[PDB]
Design a protein around this nucleic acid. Structure first.
Ligand SMILES: [Mg+2]
Ligand SMILES: [Mg+2]
Ligand SMILES: [Mg+2]
Ligand SMILES: [Mg+2]
Ligand SMILES: [Mg+2]
Ligand SMILES: [Mg+2]
Ligand SMILES: [Mg+2]
Ligand SMILES: [Mg+2]
Ligand SMILES: [Mg+2]
Ligand SMILES: [Mg+2]
Ligand SMILES: [Mg+2]
Ligand SMILES: [Mg+2]
Ligand SMILES: [Mg+2]
Ligand SMILES: [Mg+2]
Length: 62
RNA sequence: AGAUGGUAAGGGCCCACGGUGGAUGCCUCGGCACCCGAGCCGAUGAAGGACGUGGCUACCUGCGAUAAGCCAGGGGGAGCCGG
């Protein structure tokens, strides 16, 4: 389900949409690096975090 | 004075049981022929590729930095994150 709650308001992100969507896409991309960094060091990441964070940015990126 | 036994280093034929080898039978995811259908793609970048892409990924498959995937419509009704 996750998606709906998000993707719905992701469109609703039409307050300052495209611009806020760029800003948003970045924070989502920084959180990703932090993740692959912590996953890099070994015990400090638990999988799906990255997958879900990726696919999020993909629709987020629309 | 004479006469004729035994020995098998090894060999040979036969029997039994194995080793090696992959014939024979059965099998079939594939192939073959015919018939019917269907018949163009490309600068809106084709055909075909290269390098990438998974939390751990050698290869195959998929995909393309939104990267085994994103959106929506339809199908479907308990399982799902390919091999
Ligand atoms: Mg989805
Ligand atoms: Mg005598
Ligand atoms: Mg005698
Ligand atoms: Mg003998
Ligand atoms: Mg002897
Ligand atoms: Mg002997
Ligand atoms: Mg025996
Ligand atoms: Mg034999
Ligand atoms: Mg034999
Ligand atoms: Mg066949
Ligand atoms: Mg043309
Ligand atoms: Mg191609
Ligand atoms: Mg590949
Ligand atoms: Mg697909």
């Amino acid at each position: 389900m996750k998606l709906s709650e998000v993707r719905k308001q992701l469109e609703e992100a039409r307050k300052l949409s495209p611009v806020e969507l760029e800003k948003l896409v970045r924070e989502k991309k920084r959180e990703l690096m932090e993740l692959r960094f912590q996953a890099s060091i070994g015990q400090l990441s638990q999988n799906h975090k990255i997958r879900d964070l990726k696919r999020q940015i993909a629709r987020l990126l629309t």
